[PDB]
Structures are given as C-alpha cells and as structure tokens.
From a paper:
[name] is a unique [name] enzyme (CYP) involved in the biosynthesis of rufomycin, an antituberculosis cyclic peptide featuring an unusual nitrated tyrosine. [name] catalyzes tyrosyl nitration on a ribosomally synthesized pentapeptide encoded by an 18-bp gene. The newly identified pentapeptide substrate, MRYLH, is encoded by an 18-bp gene located upstream of the rufNO operon. [name] adopts a protein fold typical of CYPs, but it exhibits significant differences in the surface regions that are critical for substrate recognition and catalytic selectivity.
In this work, we apply various biophysical and biochemical techniques to investigate [name] in the presence of the peptide substrate, MRYLH, and an alternate substrate, Nle-[name], where norleucine (Nle) replaces methionine to eliminate the potential influence of sulfur oxidation. A 1.51 Å resolution crystal structure reveals that substrate binding induces significant conformational changes in the distal pocket, particularly in the regions interacting with Arg-2 and His-5 of the MRYLH peptide. The pentapeptide-bound structure adopts a closed protein conformation, contrasting with the wide-open state of the ligand-free structure. The most pronounced structural differences are observed in the F-helix and G-helix, as designated in CYP structure nomenclature. This region is highly disordered in the absence of the substrate, with residues 166–181 missing and the F-helix replaced by short turns in the ligand-free form. In the complex, however, these residues become ordered, and the F-helix emerges as a cap for the distal pocket together with the extended G-helix. Specifically, Arg-2 forms a cation-π interaction with Phe69 and a hydrogen bond with the carbonyl of Met172; amides between Tyr-3, Leu-4, and His-5, as well as the C-terminal carboxylate, are stabilized by H-bonding and salt bridge interactions with Glu84, Arg188, and Arg231. The imidazole Nδ of His-5 interacts with His235 and Glu239. Additionally, the side chain of Nle-1 occupies a hydrophobic pocket formed by surrounding nonpolar residues, and Leu-4 engages in hydrophobic interactions with Thr85. The phenol of Tyr-3 forms a short H-bond with a heme-bound water molecule modeled at half occupancy.
Author numbering:
A (entry chain A): 9 to 394
B (entry chain B): 1 to 5
Amino acid sequence: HTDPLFSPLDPAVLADPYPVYRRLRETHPVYWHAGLDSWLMTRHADCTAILRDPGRFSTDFRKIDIPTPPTLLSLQTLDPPDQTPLRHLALDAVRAQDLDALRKELTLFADQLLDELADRESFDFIHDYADVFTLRAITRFIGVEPPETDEAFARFNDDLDHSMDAQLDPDAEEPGLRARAHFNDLVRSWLGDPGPHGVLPDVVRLLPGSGVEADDVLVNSVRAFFHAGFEVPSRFLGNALAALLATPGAWEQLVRGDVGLDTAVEELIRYVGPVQALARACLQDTELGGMAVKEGQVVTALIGAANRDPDQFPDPETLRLDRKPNNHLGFGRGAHSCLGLNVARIEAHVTLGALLRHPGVRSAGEPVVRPNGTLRGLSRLPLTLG
Amino acid sequence: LRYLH
Ligand code: HEM
Ligand SMILES: [Cl-]
C-alpha cells in the first residue's frame, strides 16, 4: 500500500522531507501518486506554469464534478472571472492599510515579548512567541478582537490543519468543516460590529459597488484570510529560526552583519517556506514532463520541492543567506497569489531583528514537527535567549 | 493535499 517514492505523512519523511523531494524530482519530476489521486510536480518551471494558467488548472473543483463542501466556497476556491470581484475587494482593503504603522507596533510588541521571555530559563518559541506575535499581528491588521487561546482554539486549529491532508485520512474531513464553521461564527460576530480601523472595516466600506455580495462566500473568504494570517507566519517563523540554529555559521553571519535581512529572509522562505503543496484541477489534456495529464485529474504543485530545484537554484540544498537571484515560489503566483505577503515579510524582519539583539540564543531541547504534509511547521521549538 | 484555510 506504501507509495514507492513519496509518503508525506510517514514520520521519517515528516522529520525531513527535502531528500525525499529531491529523489522524487530526480526520478519522476511529474509523478502520478495513486494514494493522493494526483500528479505531483516537483520542478520550479512546471509549478510556475500551473499557477499562472487558471483556464487549464483550476481552484474550483466543481469544474471536475467535485462538490464544494459548506464553508469552503470562497476566494480560494473560485477562478476568474467568478473570483475577480472578491479578489479585487480583498486587494483594495489590504492596500488601504498602513504598513508603516503596523511595523512600528509589531517592533515594540516583539521587543516587549522577547524581553519577558528572556526572563525565563527557556521557553517554547512556537507557543510562547510565534503564535502570540502572529495572532496579535493578524487581529490588529484585520481590526478585530482576538479569540481566546484556550484548549478548544488549539483543537479547532489542529482539526482545520489536518483536514488539508484529508485525501490521506478521510475521517479528517468532517472535523475540518466543523472547525471552519466555528471560525465562521467568529467572523460573523466581527462583521456585525466592525471596529474603526483595519482590513475588515475597509471591506465593509468598500462593499457597495464592488460586485461582491455580503454573503457566505465573503464570510468564508474572510475566515481563510484570518486563519492563514494567524497560522502561516507562525509556521514560517519556527521553520526559519530552526534552520538558522541548525545550520553551522548561519546565525553568526546575521549577528556579525555579514549578510542583510533582505536576502536572508528571502532565502529562508525559499529554503523552509511552510506551504508545501498547491492543488489544481486539470480542465484540459496537457503534457507536462512528457506525462499525459488528463482533463478531470488533479495536479499538485509541490512548491516546497520546487524551491530546491537545481534547474532554478544553483547549490539548492544549501542555505545561502546572500542568495541572488532568488525567484522562489513561497508566496504563490497568479490569480491566487498571497494577499498577506507584505505583512508576512514585516513579521519576519521584525522577529529576526529582535532576536538578533539577544545574540546568545540557542536551542533548549528538540524541535517537534507538526504531522502535516500540506502546511509544514513546528509544534515546539525549545529556546533560550541567553 | 489541499491548501485551504
Ligand atoms: C510566511 C507567511 C505566508 C506564506 C508563506 C504564504 C503563502 C501563500 C501561498 C503560497 C498562497 C497561494 C495559494 C494558492 O495558490 O492556492 C497564499 C495565498 C493566500 N494568502 Fe498567504 N502566506 C503567508 C501569510 C499570509 C498572511 C499573513 C495572510 C493575511 C494577512 C495571508 C493571506 C492569504 C490569502 C487570503 C490567500 C488566498 C488568495 C487567493 O486565493 O486569491 N497569507 N499564501
Ligand atoms: Cl458557516
């Protein structure tokens, strides 16, 4: 039953998937994976082509006769032109925010948080820094009061994340829909009482004349915006810090100023960016890598693998913090490219800049990897600031 | 694998 090349939820693969990605790229760069019921593309050029062609590779699987479950019809699962009013509304609301004000308040918040954590013997960088920091950032950016971070919140997030892998665990589907419904209730409460500033108040202000109805598709889109904004930067910050501490000489290069944060942050996104897989429905027979991809089949762009493709990046398995050029796919391309990438970069630059003021930072225990093959990150990263 | 929040 085991796949001869790639088992994304095998614990040995979860510990370090990149050698497996590399062997797959070298052997079958366009690979039919029976368990995933999908082609897997591990090369940068093929992944770019998939993301740039919505008429051929669709996010709306209703077009290949798969119904969209409740909570999931949204900006993420519509193609142009159906997607375009929502996409333009979200772009307009995001661009109306003051990124300079956000950077100022996140810089203060990060310094305050790390000063408190430096008073501890050690701490978990994921739960005690990253999740606190990114929940603050996304709720301030949207303009809403944050949810309580209790046990139920954590279990809903785990259920939602695990449902991204529901093709390999069918029982994960219904808990994931319950988690999205839970966060939809949160979004509806926010929409009923918008605050003075933020993405959500501007969405409400821009809705008249946008071509977007204030309906469940909008609610699902705002949920996904919030949930990605909370989780994906946390996944990245943990991956990035873990890579810096594990790579000989990498942290000292930043401490000494031998490399700048601009190229370093981009190289960390290329090296250990959290999004591993972007799936699309094939709407027309297409040849990729000499393989006959058929209408009605699913293709998956393994962009984590693509970002270590030697055809695109010389010495791709090395963390080269001054890497130039660096055309990584970490924020996607085309009609569904990341709407939060400027906020995410601010979070990364702020966090790394703040950590560099504690040069003695070091691991205080083993990292723990989340058992997720689609969105990759850590559940624990024990740390001391020295 | 579906990247859907
Ligand atoms: C390091 C952090 C982040 C990374 C690596 C990342 C990565 C990505 C990627 C690869 C996509 C493409 C999805 C696809 O093609 O199906 C995407 C889409 C998206 N991201 Fe991000 N993201 C990050 C942070 C954020 C933040 C902070 C927000 C919100 C403020 C956000 C909101 C969104 C939304 C709403 C979409 C869907 C756009 C659409 O389907 O039209 N992301 N992200
Ligand atoms: Cl709902």
